[PDB]
Design a protein around this nucleic acid. Structure first.
Ligand code: SF4
Ligand SMILES: [Mg+2]
Ligand SMILES: [Mg+2]
Lengths: 61, 280, 168, 308
RNA sequence: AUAUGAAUUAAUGCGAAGUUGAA
RNA sequence: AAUUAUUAUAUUACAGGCGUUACAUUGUUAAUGAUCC
RNA sequence: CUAGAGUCUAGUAGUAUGAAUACAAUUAUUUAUAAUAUAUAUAUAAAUAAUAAAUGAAAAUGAAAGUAUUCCACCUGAAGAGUACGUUAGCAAUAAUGAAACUCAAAACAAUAGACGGUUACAG
RNA sequence: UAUAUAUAUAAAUUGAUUAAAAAUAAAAUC
């Protein structure tokens, strides 16, 4: 049985609750934001482990 | 079951939903037109209709009500001779000269094919809608649209109360009193079930009790809207169960027992198949 | 071992009726295959009246019980061609070159995937029932297949002699 | 070729040959392809979707069918034979650029080729479909490689506001250091794991005005004297280069930094050599893909019969 | 002879709700 | 005289109803509520 | 039905589990011989019955519906149709050969559970 | 030569009240 399955994260994540009607948000965007973390004023995402490249000859995948 | 049969036949023939806000009796299409003579006093929906007979068999259906009609007929000799013996004349586990028979019934009258009746029906539906007949109303105040007495009137000192299917179409409690008049009280005090009551009353309130069919109409519509949540809940219920499975089976700590793990796989595929045929 | 390593795939899932006098009674038949992908496979069947989940449950246990070792050539294919007749299905299956896909009927595809048969090309003649196809597939895999070592020992020959010569 | 549309949609969750952040998340959250509780046709269709989203999204389906090679090549662990389903694409020039880390996408490599930034053995090739023979050497203009592997150059306005905020926070830091210098030094050492002149050496900076600095970038260049960016607006050391000029690796580069086996790369010169066509070997395949062997074999069975 | 048309005419196919026999 | 009570007399909310189960939920094997005069 | 004879003869006509070869485990009966001294519960054969293996969709077959070889005849969804037309013989009757269009997603076989029958009995 | 900047307010199209999304799709910037 095939179903058009919205690619929700396999892991558990903090989903939406009661929302302001004008928020117009989707669970996938919340998963995106939680995966990244806060956005810096410079536009960066420093909190993530994957924003910055490694420097000790050990690839970070 | 029989009441269900008549109700369904009426619904498919008249199609009440196809003519909302149309009160009274005008023949209805199905060059073909038909109207209800009796028992129904209105062409609108039947207030007593619950879709499925089986729900009369449930604990919650122990107070539901149906549009039956009783009569009395005196037994002839053969029945008198026939209904005698342990097999047929005892509690199957005093005698009467008569039987009280229950039956539901319906009648349609068909319009005449002509250049007259067709335009007559068409114009009646066009220019003169009969407004919103209020609870308490007597319709056109002719035998066609009189409220029908659908329960045995309950009579006490001075006052007779009646349960009516109204030309407005809602279940109604109408109370007659010696107060409101003497003659109207006299007539209501000889009123019986299956009669058309044809006067005014001091109180004409809705027949509130066992209107749970309207509560049931809510339940079924709840199911249809929330049925579509059921599959959607079941998706995450089974997904998280299996996502839990794969985590501890990919990680392979196997906190989940071999008996129980293979039970999940049984549920996963069993839930899959049951969804298949429900499409059919 | 059993849960982590064996993989279960449903092959048949269906409703079979036994119309009794009072009414039509409907039960659920399930046929499944369990294989470790490493040279052991088995088939199981289950029949349950109330819900298919129990049918698949008993089928899974039955498949686990009948789990048997399957001869394999290079752990990727059958030793030679298998031509097998089973209750009206004619299975003609051919070993294949490394990298060859499972170019077979679907039921045979799940059976091979479960049992670790990487390479095969086959055709199903006469009746094409999935039930009979699966049963005959396993039977032809285990009865109708002989290992080159076993053939050589039965013939009292060394593997170097029995092995085919290369021609081009 | 295919017009790119909804390539990075999260609902679809298809991984693409790109270094993008959205592609990174789509790869992250997928887990593995789900081929279970599916008929053979549905398994093949899912395998097609997943694999064909990655390997050659731009290629037209009826073109990929013609390009597809039903006969593959292979030179104790198990050889993953059917991961070589899409090895034919690995010799295309744009794919070679993407695998050499000379572009952030196959489409970006295509634009690099079509815009004349690519050479193969010293002749400018302007066709993305050009197939590389073994031993070929191909090069990309270093400016475009640096743009591909570098952060976006901020606009003048964006970097000006970023500098506004940096002045604000630097003033905050020096203020707090002046108020409570000793424990500030000690607690900074606490992270790193007294001289009162320490806070005296630190010097304030003047808040800038966007309205007055607008449209005058040489003036803004002189007006900034932060200790870390001296006399240049943030990210615009030389504003005439296509990238963040104090050259900075682009965000989210570690996840997608695979060094291919079949290519030998020289990043200092932005050159590469096509050693061989990718070949599967016991326990390893040189076709860089994010999908497991079952998905590739299902796609291979699909394309062998052309969906029959 | 190979075709093309024909008053007159043979058989049979379908379907509509039915009508009649009891093979 | 003001207040508070009590006691009358008015005062209207109302009391009253062997009215309702096609008026329900409890309780049991009458009560509350809803409505009606 | 046709002629010749005094009812008979002479007729026309041609309807209403293929053959052969090689091989194939038992048991129990018979059956026919061949012996050896009724007994060897005698051996060799064929007929009958239940099997094994094998075959089959099964029923069932089980020395053939099995394993093989060779030759012939026949079949290609149902209905139209063994119909029409033509020819062949026949005084004729009939027979042989024998389509096509249209319509449909059917149709059929073995077996399973059922309710049905004046179907059978038998009981309670 | 600091750097997980934090606070407020304001708005916020279609659908929907969360695993219901359209949607990185637009705009904007390089
Ligand atoms: S309750 Fe009224 S409308 Fe309903 S069936 Fe009875 S008479 Fe007709
Ligand atoms: Mg589908
Ligand atoms: Mg809205």
């Amino acid at each position: 049985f095939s179903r058009r399955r919205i690619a929700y994260p396999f892991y558990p994540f903090k989903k939406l609750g009661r929302q302001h009607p004008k928020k117009h948000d989707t669970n996938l965007k919340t998963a995106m934001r939680q995966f990244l973390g806060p956005k810096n004023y410079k536009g960066e995402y420093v909190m993530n482990k994957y924003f910055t490249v490694p420097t000790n000859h050990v690839p970070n995948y | 079951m029989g009441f269900e049969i008549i109700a369904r036949a009426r619904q498919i023939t008249l199609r009440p939903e196809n003519f909302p806000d149309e009160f009274g009796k005008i023949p209805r299409p199905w060059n073909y037109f038909l109207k209800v003579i009796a028992p129904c006093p209105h062409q609108r929906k039947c207030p007593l209709q619950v879709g499925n007979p089986n729900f009369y068999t449930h604990k919650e259906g122990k107070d539901l009500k149906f549009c039956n009609f009783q009569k009395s007929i005196k037994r002839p000799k053969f029945s008198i001779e026939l209904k005698k013996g342990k097999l047929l004349a005892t509690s199957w586990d005093n005698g009467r000269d008569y039987e009280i028979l229950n039956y539901s019934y319906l009648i349609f009258e068909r319009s005449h094919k002509d250049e007259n009746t067709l335009k007559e029906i068409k114009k009646l539906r066009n220019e003169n809608v009969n407004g919103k007949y209020d609870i308490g109303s007597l319709g056109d105040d002719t035998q066609n649209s009189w409220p029908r007495i659908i329960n045995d009137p309950v009579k006490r000192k001075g006052h007779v109360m009646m349960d009516l299917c109204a030309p407005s179409g809602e279940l109604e409690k109408w109370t007659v009193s010696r107060s409101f008049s003497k003659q109207i009280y006299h007539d209501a005090r000889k009123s019986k079930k299956g009669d058309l009551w044809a006067s005014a009353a001091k109180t004409q309130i809705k027949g509130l009790g066992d209107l749970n069919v309207k509560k049931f109409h809510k339940l079924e519509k709840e199911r249809i809207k929330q049925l579509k949540k059921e599959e959607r809940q079941k998706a995450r219920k089974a997904m998280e169960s299996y996502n839990e499975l794969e985590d501890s089976l990919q990680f392979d700590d196997h906190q989940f027992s071999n008996f129980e793990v293979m039970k999940k796989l049984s549920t996963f595929h069993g839930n899959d198949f049951l969804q298949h045929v429900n499409r059919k | 071992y059993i849960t982590r390593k064996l993989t279960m795939k449903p092959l048949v899932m269906k409703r079979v009726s036994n119309q009794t006098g009072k009414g039509k009674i409907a039960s659920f038949y399930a046929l499944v295959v369990v294989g470790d992908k490493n040279g052991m496979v088995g088939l199981g069947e289950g029949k349950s009246r109330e819900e298919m989940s129990k049918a698949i449950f008993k089928a899974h246990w039955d498949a686990v019980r009948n789990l048997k070792e399957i001869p394999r050539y290079e752990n990727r294919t059958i030793y030679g061609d298998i031509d097998f007749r089973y209750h009206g299905v004619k299975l003609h299956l051919r070993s294949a070159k490394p990298g060859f896909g499972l170019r077979v009927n679907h039921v045979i595809f799940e059976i091979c995937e479960c049992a670790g048969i990487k390479d095969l090309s086959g055709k199903v003649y006469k009746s094409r029932n999935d039930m009979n196809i699966a049963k005959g597939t396993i039977e032809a895999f285990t009865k109708a297949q002989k290992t080159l070592d076993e053939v050589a020992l039965g013939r009292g020959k060394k593997l170097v002699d029995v092995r085919k010569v290369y021609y081009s | 070729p295919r017009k790119a549309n909804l390539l990075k949609s999260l609902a679809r969750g298809r991984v693409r040959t790109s270094f993008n952040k959205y592609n990174l998340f789509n790869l992250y959250k997928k887990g593995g392809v789900d081929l279970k509780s599916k008929s053979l046709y549905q398994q093949k269709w899912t395998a097609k979707q997943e694999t064909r989203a990655y390997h050659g999204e731009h290629l037209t389906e009826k073109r990929w069918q013609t390009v597809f090679k039903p006969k593959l090549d292979s030179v104790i662990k198990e050889t993953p034979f059917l991961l070589q389903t899409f090895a034919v694409l690995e010799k295309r020039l744009d794919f070679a650029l993407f695998r050499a880390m000379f572009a952030s996408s196959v489409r970006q490599a295509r634009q690099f080729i079509l815009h004349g930034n690519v050479r193969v053995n010293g002749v400018k090739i302007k066709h993305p479909s050009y197939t590389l023979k073994p031993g070929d050497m191909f090069s990309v203009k270093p400016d475009k490689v640096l743009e591909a592997l570098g952060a976006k150059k901020p606009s003048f306005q964006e970097a000006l506001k970023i500098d506004k905020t940096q002045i604000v926070l630097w003033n905050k830091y020096v203020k707090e250091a002046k108020t409570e210098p000793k424990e500030v030094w000690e607690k900074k050492l606490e992270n790193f794991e007294f001289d009162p002149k320490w806070a005296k050496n630190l010097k304030y900076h003047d808040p800038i005005k966007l309205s007055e600095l607008e449209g005058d970038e040489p003036k803004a260049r002189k007006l900034i004297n932060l200790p870390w960016q001296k006399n240049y607006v943030y990210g615009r050391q030389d504003p005439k280069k296509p990238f963040f000029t104090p050259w900075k690796p682009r965000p989210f580069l570690s996840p997608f930094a695979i060094l291919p086996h079949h290519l030998e790369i020289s990043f200092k010169t932005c050159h590469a050599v096509y050693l061989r066509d990718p070949v599967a070997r016991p326990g390893q395949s040189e076709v860089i893909s994010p999908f497991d062997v079952p998905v590739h074999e299902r796609a291979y069975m699909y394309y062998l019969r052309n969906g029959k």
